[PDB]
Design a protein around this nucleic acid. Structure first.
Lengths: 78, 113, 74, 165
RNA sequence: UCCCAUAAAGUUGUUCUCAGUUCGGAUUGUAGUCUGCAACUCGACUACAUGAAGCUGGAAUCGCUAGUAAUCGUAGAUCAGCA
RNA sequence: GCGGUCGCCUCCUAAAAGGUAACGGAGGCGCUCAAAGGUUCCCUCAGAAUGGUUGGAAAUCAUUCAUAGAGUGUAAAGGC
């Protein structure tokens, strides 16, 4: 990938930083797999799936070079 | 024989014939010849007493590891074992690589045809 | 002494990069360098070891892959 | 060297590590039983006979499995040579500190043994390594099991600086 | 005409005397040229070279009387990646 | 009648000496060994777990709990 503008979302990270007032964790709900991340991620899921819900995801010191939901299940073997 | 583990063969040139031992081999071996008088001699069992000492003290001072970093494979897998990639979505899911897991032939991950 | 088991083997001489610390019992044959009285006055050709060059044991070295990294401008 | 290194550090500690009554209740090093093994019943066992000429002092006896359950049992093969340290070789390939010539699994455990008979296994190619891998780069099993001069792990432990593991 | 100009070989052929051996670019690896509103299962081939498939071929397979093909070949029509 | 047995060795029945029957209940023998024979030395059993390429819970030598619960060329008792 490239440097220079990791693509922190405007709407999404607005929803974060202004919904990151307290410890109350409302993370994404976004059913969207396009974000990009800061060091200030504070304990919460994501929803990095769109089947009929919203999927909890990795929170602490996860994959560090990525800009999306690299760990989020949708499928496997069968 | 001495640079890492052992490497026996003869009659050939020591410059890149390092390919056996992990991390590095031949290509980098003949491209990392950055020392004081180390070079391919076609006599892998001659001409060498202390030159190996210095051009090995480098390999220990070559903090870029090689064999010692054989485990960066395993440890970058260790980071990914949350079903991400190269360890969970490529090792815990038992799939192939090339992102043609199976449309062509495959022996290394699936050895059974 | 009851002989009829092990062959011929005694002490030898070996000097290292550091401190020259390998002089215990041996069975090692090779060609003499130059002999002493602080150590062998005989074929000195136990060669050289890691015996005192660096241990990993009570020592330090370089670390693993890396940290988060998206903290210094990414 | 080593035989005196079974003295150079230890006579004062092994005269103090305990605070027993007389010098002789306060022990020395317990003797060793340098033993090797095999995982083949024929040729690796028939051709793993010298590595003792390398490490031990015994020419090579031919003891076999005794307890010998369903598929352990065989006869007369030289899988376990009785090269136990009596007094002369009681400074054998054991107290050679060539277990650092691996740089893996130095401190294996929090402790060693609830049975005083300790086992210290150079598993892999940890030991006899000052010899290049000519014929020693094939199948080779070890069996370094012997007791020490301490009833449990406790005082055995924080004076064990001899073999430092 | 005028830019891709070593275009790749037959032109001297550095380099590895038959051990899977300095032949390898497959996976158990590190991943990358730059034009994307976002490579976890959502292609690459790769160099940093992981040294594997391999040593002539079955009940199971490939050009053929001139430059066509053996081998590739300047590139790209198609189109913000790649024959 | 058919079938099966017919000689020699060990134990139980057999009632604390010996002996003692039935188509009563169990096993064996028709050898083997120059050494497994004679003599002088020298040594020591099981069921026990240790954590030791390897582990087949059992591939090893130790260590200690080890009381004959081991081993005797061959079945069984009496013995060591």
């Amino acid at each position: 990938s490239i440097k220079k503008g990791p693509f922190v979302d405007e709407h999404l990270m607005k929803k974060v930083e202004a919904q990151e007032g307290s410890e109350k964790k409302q993370v994404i709900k976004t059913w969207s797999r396009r974000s990009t991340i800061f060091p200030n991620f504070i304990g919460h899921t994501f929803a990095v799936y769109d089947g009929r819900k919203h999927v909890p995801v990795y929170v602490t010191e996860d994959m560090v070079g990525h800009k999306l939901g690299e760990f989020a299940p949708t499928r496997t073997f069968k | 024989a001495r640079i890492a583990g052992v490497d026996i063969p003869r009659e050939k040139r020591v410059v890149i014939s390092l390919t056996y031992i992990y991390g590095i081999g031949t290509s980098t071996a003949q491209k990392i010849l950055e020392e004081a008088n180390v070079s391919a001699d076609t006599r892998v069992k001659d001409l060498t007493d202390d030159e190996l000492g210095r051009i090995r003290e480098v390999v220990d001072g070559y903090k870029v590891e090689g064999d010692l970093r054989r485990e960066t494979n395993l440890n970058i897998k260790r980071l990914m074992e949350i079903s991400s990639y190269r360890g969970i979505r490529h090792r815990r899911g038992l799939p192939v690589r090339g992102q043609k897991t199976k449309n062509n032939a495959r022996t290394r991950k699936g050895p059974v045809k | 002494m009851k002989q009829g088991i092990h062959p011929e083997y005694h002490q030898v001489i070996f000097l290292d990069t550091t401190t020259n610390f390998k002089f215990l019992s041996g069975s090692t044959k090779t060609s003499s360098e130059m002999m002493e009285w602080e150590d062998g006055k005989e074929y000195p050709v136990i060669r050289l070891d890691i015996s005192s060059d660096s241990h990993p044991f009570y020592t330090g070295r370089q670390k693993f892959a890396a940290a988060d990294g998206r903290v210094e401008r990414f | 060297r080593l035989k005196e290194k079974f003295n150079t550090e230890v006579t004062e500690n092994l005269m103090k590590k305990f605070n027993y009554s007389s010098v002789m209740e306060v022990p020395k090093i317990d003797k060793i039983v340098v033993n090797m093994g095999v995982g083949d019943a024929v040729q690796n066992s028939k051709v793993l006979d010298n590595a003792v000429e390398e490490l031990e002092l015994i020419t090579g006896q031919k003891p076999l499995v005794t307890k010998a359950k369903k598929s352990i049992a065989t006869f007369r093969l030289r899988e376990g040579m009785p090269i136990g340290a009596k007094v002369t070789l009681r400074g054998e390939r054991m107290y050679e500190f060539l277990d650092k010539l691996i740089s893996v699994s130095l401190p294996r455990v929090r402790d060693f043994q609830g049975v005083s008979k300790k086992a210290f296994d150079g598993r892999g190619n940890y030991t006899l390594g000052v010899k290049e891998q000519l014929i020693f780069p094939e199948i080779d099993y070890d069996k370094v099991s012997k007791v020490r001069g301490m009833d449990i792990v406790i005082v055995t432990t924080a004076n064990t600086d001899e073999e430092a593991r």
